[PDB]
Every structure is written in structure tokens, then in C-alpha cells.
Design a protein around this ligand. Structure first.
Ligand SMILES: Nc1ncnc2[nH]cnc12
Ligand SMILES: Nc1ncnc2[nH]cnc12
Ligand SMILES: N[C@@H](CCS)C(=O)O
Ligand SMILES: N[C@@H](CCS)C(=O)O
Lengths: 233, 232
């Protein structure tokens, strides 16, 4: 079997571009997850449409890894840009992922850390470097750092500040990345976030998100398609 | 073809009583999850030790349903008792589960609701009724109602107050019940929470938990054993 790239998006809109380019595409529904398998530019792809949130992402990534057994997982889609300088369309790549809504400090764990897991899931160095390299060659504005996940859509300066008080270096926020990373950590599969900004996570985040989710999916998908051509075996 | 009962606990202490009563026992490790298969009093059992939290419970429950295909799922273990009158060792049965830490109200979803999911997962009425029948039959103190899950160990009166402000009827809090319910909902498998109080989720919760987690595991597991014997 040749290399198989795993790609995960939460919403239909986040996987629509990659999905519509796959040939010999098969569709398998497992509980709340839809897995597409087929080829893009002669490369085997397993594309997961998980649904929104930590548990939907965990169900779908578990089903993806058990059914398609991809060699790596790239989390594509939209994200809230919390770091200064981020604009809608900008690419955000994860160095690491942490939950902004997990708290077992009552037993000495670091904030965001769940028992039996590292406080931070370290993203795959080689995938993250490839994403930033392809992004620079494409001339796409790109930023690399901490992605914080939680079962919340961040839509206020107060909520942004609460997250920054716990995770000062937080670059982007979304609702599945850390959950996908936890599943990939547990199955020992290389993982990286390659998303694009749809909003600033502030009081105008819901309007911005509705207006720029397509842009974020297009910019995110263009970088992932570039990574697909480079990843061979 | 014979009925297979799925049982889920997050911690080793929450599943050890049931693990130690299984015969013809096999052990399978899938990622962060441990699944024991075998029998208790001649009944087929699939027992999952998932690990703590929503994602660990989701990985584990997904693996459990795909591997063992149990006919139902019972979540055993401990919980913070927030409803008035709850004492360590009391049984809490779920009528429904809701995330106290989910918020997509920015798009008009109900507080605690994730898109493509009901705002609350309705527990299986026949399993909850059986749990309350068996509990009352053994003079076991029992309360039935809303269990709220979150990736947090509740350890202060303020955190309880904020959860109660969002979910006024919250009876108990824990970290996996709603995640297991979401997986069981997605796979269309009947589900119910049958846990026991280890603390009050207040400033003393961590110390109480350390002393009463074992009592909670013993009372929860004792009731799940009564359920196993009656199910068919
Ligand atoms: N502001 C935000 N909060 C959470 N997830 C998001 N995905 C895109 N924007 C987001
Ligand atoms: N206070 C608490 N918070 C979360 N999970 C618990 N399990 C038992 N007690 C708990
Ligand atoms: N399902 C929502 C987005 C939640 S992240 C919407 O379509 O607007
Ligand atoms: N590590 C804790 C339990 C996790 S909440 C303990 O040993 O009591």
C-alpha cells in the first residue's frame, strides 16, 4: 500500500473543495462521521467530515484511523485568529495544541491537561515545516504556534482574554484540533493543524465566520493540496 | 446473539470491581482504551476502561461499539453530587445528559448543545427504570435526573454556582457521561448513567474524592451487578 494522507474537517464546507477533487471516491458513514477515500493527483486520500466539537472529532478520527489507517492526519478548516496581525484568509499551523476548557488543577495537573496525556500535544515537526514551506512558496500569509481547542465558539473580547490569561501565546482557537491530536497521540499517528482564519473570535466573530468560512476553506485546502503532492511513499 | 451489556468506567478504580468478577476474560487495548470481554454470572459483558475526559471516553466508547457491539451501555463510576441531600455513596441515575462546558449560543444553539446533536441526550428509560428498581430493592439511596459532563473536575462553590446558573436542575457533575451518550446517540445504542457520589464538587471535593472514590465505585458497581443479572 502506497502512502495515505488523512485529512480531517469538521463541517461540510471545510471538506467540500478536497472532496469534489477526489476521483474513485467512496463514501463510508460511521456513526456521526463520513469518511471519503479516493485519489487526488494520483495520491490516496482518506478525508474525514467529523461534525463539530471534541466528541464528534474523537468519534470520527477513531473511525478514520481504524478504517483507513492513514500514515498522517492534517486538520483542515477555519479558526478564530486571536494573535495580533492575523487577517481572514491567513494560514495558521500548529506547533502544539492544548484544550482551553479542560481543568483538573484540583489534582495538580497543568491547566488544559487531561490525566494520562501531555499538557500539550506536540504537532508533527516535518508536517508543520512542510506546511510553512509550501505556504511561503504559494505567497500565503502564514503563522505557526499554539492552537487552543474547546467545545465553545469564541465570540467576545472577554472570552478571548480568559483564554489568553491561561494560555498567553495562544495564536488560534477552534473546536476539534486538540481532540484530533489526542486521538492521534493515543494511536501514535503524526498530526498537524493547517487551518485558515475566518474571524477574530471577538463580538463580530459570528458575522465574520458566516462571511469568510468559504475563504478560509479555499486558502486552507490550497495549502493542503500542495502538501498532498509533496507527500509520497 | 445473546444479549451483551457494555459497561464504561473512566478510571481503573471505577472498573476494577467488575473486571475482577469477569470469567472467560479477554483484554484488548485500542489506543488509550482497555476493553475486557467475558461473562459475569453467565451474562456476556464488554467492559471499557476509557480514561478521564470527553475525548478519552469518545475514543473508548467508539472502539467498544465497533469491537464488541454491546446491546446497551451503562456508565459506572463516581460523580460530584450538587443536588441538595446527596451524600457520598448515594446513587445518581441519568434521565438525560448535557455538557455544562459546551457553548455555540453564538449561532443560536441551546447552551450545552453541540450542532447535529439534541441539546440533551435522553437516557434509555428502561435501563434508568431498572437501575432505580434495583437500587430501591436494596434500600440504596438513589436520585434520578440531569447529569452534566465537562472536561473539568468541579472543586469550588463558584464553579457549582456557574453550572447551576446554566443548568438549574443539575443533579451531578462528572467528566465522561455526556461524551459516552453522544457516541451511543451517534451509533443508536441505548445508554444510561449509574454512578455514585464521591464528593460535593465544592472546595473539599478533591479530599472527599480521595476518601470516597472507592465507596462510590463499590455502590455503583454493586447496582450495575444487580442490573446485569436482570437484563435479557
Ligand atoms: N471564533 C471561533 N471559535 C471557535 N471555533 C472557531 N472556528 C472558527 N472561528 C472560531
Ligand atoms: N467534583 C467532580 N467533578 C468532576 N468529576 C467528578 N467525579 C467525581 N467527583 C467529580
Ligand atoms: N453550524 C454553524 C457554525 C458553528 S461553528 C453555522 O453554520 O453557522
Ligand atoms: N490522580 C487522581 C485522580 C484523577 S482526577 C488521584 O489519584 O486521586
Amino acid at each position: 500500500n502506497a502512502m495515505k494522507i488523512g485529512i480531517v474537517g469538521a463541517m461540510a464546507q471545510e471538506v467540500e473543495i478536497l472532496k469534489n477533487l477526489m476521483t474513485e471516491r467512496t463514501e463510508t458513514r460511521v456513526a456521526s462521521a463520513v469518511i471519503f477515500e479516493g485519489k487526488i493527483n494520483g495520491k490516496d486520500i482518506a478525508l474525514l467530515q467529523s461534525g463539530i466539537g471534541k466528541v464528534a472529532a474523537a468519534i470520527g478520527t477513531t473511525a478514520l484511523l481504524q478504517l483507513a489507517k492513514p500514515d498522517c492526519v492534517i486538520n483542515t478548516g477555519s479558526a478564530g485568529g486571536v494573535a495580533k496581525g492575523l487577517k481572514v484568509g491567513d494560514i495558521v499551523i500548529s506547533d502544539e495544541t492544548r484544550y482551553h476548557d479542560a481543568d483538573v488543577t484540583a489534582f495538580g495537573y497543568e491547566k488544559g491537561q487531561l490525566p494520562a496525556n501531555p499538557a500539550a500535544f506536540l504537532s508533527d515537526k516535518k508536517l508543520a515545516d512542510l506546511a510553512q514551506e509550501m505556504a511561503e512558496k504559494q505567497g500565503q500569509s502564514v503563522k505557526r504556534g499554539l492552537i487552543c481547542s474547546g467545545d465553545s465558539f469564541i465570540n467576545s473580547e472577554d472570552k478571548i482574554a480568559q483564554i489568553q490569561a491561561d494560555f498567553p501565546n495562544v495564536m488560534g482557537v477552534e473546536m476539534e484540533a486538540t481532540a484530533i491530536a489526542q486521538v492521534c497521540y493515543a494511536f501514535n499517528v503524526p498530526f498537524v493543524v493547517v487551518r485558515a482564519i475566518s474571524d477574530g473570535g471577538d463580538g463580530k466573530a459570528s458575522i465574520s465566520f458566516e462571511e469568510f468560512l468559504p475563504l478560509a476553506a479555499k486558502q486552507s485546502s490550497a495549502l493542503v493540496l500542495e502538501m498532498i503532492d509533496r507527500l509520497s511513499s
